[PDB]
Ligand binder design. Structure first.
Ligand SMILES: [Mg+2]
Lengths: 328, 172
């Protein structure tokens, strides 16, 4: 049974300033971090009848400064774990007919909004080391960040997205983006913004008041309620055909498409295994996977090669249990 | 209709035009402290929130000085070249012109003036900033002013926050 198998987390990460004048990218990886309630995972068509280990991966592409992306790095997964614990307790007591996608929707919406209110100084926030909560903005009104987050467990990938960072799954031979960029030229977003009294203006791409190229993000109170911190969530059962999952800021996506990124990641992961002995089983999943790290490294080099003039952050995640080469 | 027929049959791109606007902001700090911040053409990062770096080669503070600015990510621009046009320490006026960079603000010049103003019994400062610029290709007068005013209002809001914090610390 898939809900019974050991989920060993295999990943690599690169986050560099690149050709930029300052670093505004941040990221967070927390293996074996969450305890996901099976009832939020199992589909209706499956049998009935506690929790699966969940791994957390997040990429935060800051704009207007670095303080919001950093706060997200430091806090967002903890906020999410608080929210899961809440819903987990309600689900143990009551049970609606709530679809899975709807459950994860409310968990991530609350979590993203909580982080956003804390940043704005509207929600009381704990400080590491201190017994006392404070009500105080973490950053000025012009600072914001995208947030793309993925929970991985044995049966499912759940992605929550706010902004134009992106998560892409390689299944079989096809890239499958697991998020849809929040951009003002989306008709739903355009209408949301214009109906709220805002302007979408063509200025090196469609921009909120000509300024911001994304229609959602965490922070950016100067442009509320036009840009909002509300994510969209993708609930994605895994497949034996899945190869790898990539999360990245636009330092990567501006210069390569989804299909070529996936094809390149898979190839570099495979090349590593053809030339290296499998790592010691015991130490696997305790830190970065060298195959994945080689893949993320190569992608960042390629992106720079192709003229990316931005911060580049990439997390490569290997979804194959094992990669052996049958021959003879 | 009206606006539709026009957008389809009567949309011509003019070789060139220029728009202009004005913004205002009350700051709860004495004008001398506000001016001590604003007069520093060579250090706009003291209060302009989108500036990641600013370099001035040669004379730092006097008419003709030139500053090279690198911007933080997220804007439709990454750098700007600006020349100090007016630095009036008698009238508290600062005028600049943009002469380079990868923005779409051509022939941009702007002016900020400070004026003393008491409100709710507390003496503070009224900042007024205006600009004039060429409307770029593909955009309207209105659109161009939404963009610029967004930028300028952010600058003024930050100016107010910085100088108010400074004034608070001073009191103590
Ligand atoms: Mg970026």
């Amino acid at each position: 049974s898939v809900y019974e198998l050991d989920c060993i987390p295999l990943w690599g990460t690169v986050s560099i300033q690149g050709n930029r004048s300052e670093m505004e990218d941040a990221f967070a990886v927390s293996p074996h971090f969450l305890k996901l309630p099976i009832k939020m995972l199992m589909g209706d068509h499956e049998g009935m009848s506690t929790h699966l280990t969940g791994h957390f991966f997040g990429v935060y592409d800051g704009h207007g400064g670095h303080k919001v992306a950093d706060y997200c790095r430091d806090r967002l997964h903890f906020a999410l774990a608080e929210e899961i614990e809440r819903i987990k307790d309600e689900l143990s007591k009551r049970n609606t007919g709530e679809g899975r996608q709807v459950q994860w929707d409310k968990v991530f919406t609350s979590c993203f909004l909580t982080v956003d209110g804390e940043i704005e100084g509207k929600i009381g926030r704990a400080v590491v080391g201190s017994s006392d909560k404070v009500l105080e903005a973490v950053a000025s009104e012009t600072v914001g960040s995208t947030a793309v987050v993925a929970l991985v467990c044995s049966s499912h990938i759940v992605v929550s997205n706010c902004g134009d960072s992106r998560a892409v799954l390689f299944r079989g031979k096809e890239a499958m983006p697991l998020s849809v960029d929040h951009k003002p030229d989306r008709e739903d977003e355009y209408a949301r913004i214009e109906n709220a009294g805002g302007k979408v203006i063509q200025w090196q791409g469609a921009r909120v008041f000509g300024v911001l190229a994304m229609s959602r993000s965490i922070g950016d109170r100067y442009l509320k309620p036009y840009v909002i911190p509300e994510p969209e969530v993708t609930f994605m059962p895994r497949s034996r055909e899945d190869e790898c999952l990539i999360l990245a800021s636009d330092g990567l996506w501006d210069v390569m498409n989804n299909q070529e990124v996936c094809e390149i990641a898979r190839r570099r992961i495979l090349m590593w295994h053809k030339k290296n002995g499998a790592p010691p089983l015991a130490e696997r999943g305790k830190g970065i996977d060298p195959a994945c790290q080689a893949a993320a490294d190569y992608l960042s080099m390629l992106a720079l090669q192709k003229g990316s003039k931005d911060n580049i952050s990439i997390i490569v995640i290997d979804l194959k249990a094992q990669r052996k080469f049958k021959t003879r | 209709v009206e606006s539709e027929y026009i957008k389809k049959h009567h949309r011509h791109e003019l070789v060139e035009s220029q728009c202009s606007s004005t913004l205002v902001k009350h700051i709860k700090a004495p004008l001398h402290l506000v001016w001590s911040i604003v007069r520093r053409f060579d250090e706009p990062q003291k209060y302009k929130p989108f500036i990641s770096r600013c370099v001035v080669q040669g004379k730092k503070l006097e008419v003709g000085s030139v500053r090279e600015v690198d911007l933080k990510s997220g804007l439709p621009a990454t750098k700007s070249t600006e020349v100090l046009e007016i630095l009036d320490d008698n009238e508290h006026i600062l005028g600049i012109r943009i002469v380079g960079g990868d923005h779409r603000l051509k022939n941009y010049s702007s002016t900020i003036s400070l004026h003393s103003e008491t409100i709710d019994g507390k003496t503070g400062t009224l900042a007024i900033e205006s600009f004039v610029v060429d409307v770029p290709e593909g955009n309207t007068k209105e659109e161009t002013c939404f963009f610029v005013e967004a930028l300028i209002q952010s600058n003024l809001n930050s100016l107010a926050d910085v100088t108010e914090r400074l004034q608070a610390e001073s009191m103590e």
